[PDB]
Design a protein around this ligand. Structure first.
Ligand SMILES: CC(C)CCn1c(=O)c(C2=Nc3ccc(NS(C)(=O)=O)cc3S(=O)(=O)N2)c(O)c2cccn21
Length: 562
């Protein structure tokens, strides 16, 4: 069937849309080539509509069914609980889109009677009706990128499809425990969202050296959400139903699948029918889990089809990387085409065709790659990094505009050991924070699709817990990494790293002057900026701030707050 059917009604904005980078007094200190940074808007939605719209055909063989049977066997060991309304309400972001039915997210969060009555209303309807399609809103995302003159020009807006706030609370009640716990049980070590950045690097490195002659590839599915068929969504459901569940949860999971997950009508922000979806909704609770299960299923089956030797997979939703035994370059190339042929029969064709890699550092997955530095004692250390272009374009946007999500903060957290996050991101945003005296002000950020409120003053504690103390001491980065950073800087008109070292010594001194947690920030975050360094010991406050639920599961589009 067609992934989408369209009426012709436009996908409409909800708020003001800016496409050119906002400029203020801080902008040039970060980035000079302003016209290279852009945000996508609804203006491009029509183009995105074109590319997400195609017919899907699926051809399912014994390999597919074999792997599914294995997955279901593991699923059957999961016992999951229903969340109460109140529990579900507390998982709602303070800034989540308001209900069409006369209440918003803050009404949900403090359990207003209007919100709770309506939520109980929605739940009862799910239990009683297993057929009526549930309405969804379709919006164009506003995301920030750098122009890619060769690779394209400007990316069209991605589309987000989501049901009403009352429905989203019900999804949590039915499925939050399932989507949090089932992926690791079914996929074990291949489930990517269980890992911190450091744990992901370790899994990648251990898997690489566990092979006699390693080969690896990332597999990029063309518009993965659009490739997800009614079959795939019913198969996901059958996996969920393997769990030990309350009878009400079984019924609700069945309604939500038939009424929402499989497809339904698409409404714009003006209330017009835009058409109909028959593929994955990007803004539902099960988006991450559904995608991960489906990607893992098709790929495991495809490896058996291509006869890949000892294939290990790492799956984060639609993001897939495979490490296996090499059969030499020409055979590996042949094997990947067969893998791709099988994935294609399964309705997951490639965007850019997969290429075999024999150097772990050249494999990019979840927009990231393994690289090497040295800790204080000269020991070689693997850590996770990425091309800094997008993070830096977004930092530029966030320099002049308060955004719902502060990408810079998430990027400091996740990419703390990197050269570019330490020298540019920490330096730039701490300087801003000092000047506004907003070190103490909690900021929203996203990690694995979930929203978190975080105080920049807790960064040292958070970084130690995720990465270790070595994150504050790394040096002697690789020539490939240094080269990529310097080149990105030249491209965007970012001051050279020598300038950042200079600003950092200033930021460091100012923080240390402040005393307290601010001083701890100066000491730990910026120890790299001094010629002779303080000895970095574990900070006492690092324990009590518990990172509960940080790397359990992914929740992209799932409207989750912690
Ligand atoms: C160590 C890290 C894997 C490094 C990179 N990184 C991430 O991958 C993600 C991340 N991974 C994803 C991958 C694939 C999907 N696709 S889907 C829609 O669920 O099918 C979704 C996500 S996400 O929205 O859950 N966020 C981050 O939140 C983040 C923050 C800062 C770095 N990251």
């Amino acid at each position: 069937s067609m992934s989408y059917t369209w009426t012709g009604a436009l996908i409409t904005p909800c708020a003001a849309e800016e496409s050119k980078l906002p400029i203020n007094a801080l902008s040039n200190s970060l980035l000079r080539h302003h016209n290279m940074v852009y945000a996508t808007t609804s203006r491009s939605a029509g183009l995105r509509q074109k590319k997400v719209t195609f017919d899907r055909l699926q051809v399912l063989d014994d390999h597919y069914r074999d792997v599914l049977k294995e997955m279901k066997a593991k699923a059957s060991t999961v016992k999951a609980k229903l969340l109460s309304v109140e529990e579900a309400c507390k998982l709602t972001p303070p800034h989540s889109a308001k209900s069409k039915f006369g209440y918003g997210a803050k009404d949900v969060r403090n359990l207003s009677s209007k919100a709770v009555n309506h939520i109980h209303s929605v739940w009862k309807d799910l239990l009683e009706d297993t057929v009526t399609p549930i309405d969804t809103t379709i919006m164009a995302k506003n995301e920030v990128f750098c122009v890619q003159p060769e690779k394209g020009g400007r990316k069209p807006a991605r589309l987000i499809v989501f049901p009403d706030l009352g429905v989203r609370v019900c999804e949590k009640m039915a499925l939050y425990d399932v989507v949090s716990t089932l992926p690791q049980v079914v996929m074990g070590s291949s489930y990517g969202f269980q890992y911190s950045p450091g744990q992901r690097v370790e899994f990648l490195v251990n898997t690489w050296k566990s092979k006699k002659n390693p080969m690896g590839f990332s597999y990029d599915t063309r518009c993965f959400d659009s490739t997800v068929t009614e079959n795939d969504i019913r198969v996901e459901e059958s996996i969920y139903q393997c769990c030990d569940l309350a009878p009400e949860a079984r019924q609700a999971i069945k309604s939500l699948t038939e009424r929402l997950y499989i497809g339904g009508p698409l409404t714009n922000s003006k209330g017009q029918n835009c058409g109909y979806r028959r593929c994955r909704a990007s803004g539902v609770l099960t988006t991450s889990c559904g995608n991960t299960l489906t990607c893992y299923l098709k790929a495991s089956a495809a490896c058996r089809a291509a006869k890949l030797q000892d294939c290990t997979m790492l799956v984060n939703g639609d993001d897939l990387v495979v490490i296996c035994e090499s059969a030499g370059t020409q055979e590996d190339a042949a094997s990947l085409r067969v893998f791709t042929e099988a994935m294609t029969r399964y309705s997951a064709p490639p965007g850019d065709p997969p290429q075999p890699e024999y150097d772990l550092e050249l494999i990019t997955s979840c927009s990231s790659n393994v690289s090497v530095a040295h800790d204080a004692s000269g020991k070689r250390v693997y850590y996770l990094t990425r091309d800094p272009t997008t993070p830096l374009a977004r930092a530029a946007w966030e320099t002049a505009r308060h955004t719902p999500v502060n990408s810079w903060l998430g990027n400091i957290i996740m990419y703390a050991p990197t050269l570019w996050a330490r020298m540019i991101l920490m330096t730039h945003f701490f300087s801003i924070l000092l000047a506004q005296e907003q070190l103490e002000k909690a900021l929203d950020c996203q990690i694995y699709g979930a929203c978190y409120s975080i105080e920049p003053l807790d960064l040292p504690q958070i970084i130690e817990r995720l990465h270790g103390l070595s994150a504050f001491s790394l040096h002697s980065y690789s020539p490939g990494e240094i080269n990529r950073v310097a080149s990105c800087l030249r491209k965007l008109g970012v001051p050279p790293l020598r300038v950042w070292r200079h600003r950092a010594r200033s930021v460091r001194a100012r923080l240390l002057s402040q005393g307290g947690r601010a001083a701890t920030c100066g000491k730990y975050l910026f120890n790299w900026a001094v010629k002779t360094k303080l000895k970095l010991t574990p900070i006492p406050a690092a324990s009590q701030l518990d990172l509960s639920g940080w790397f359990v599961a992914g929740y992209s589009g799932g409207d989750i707050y912690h």
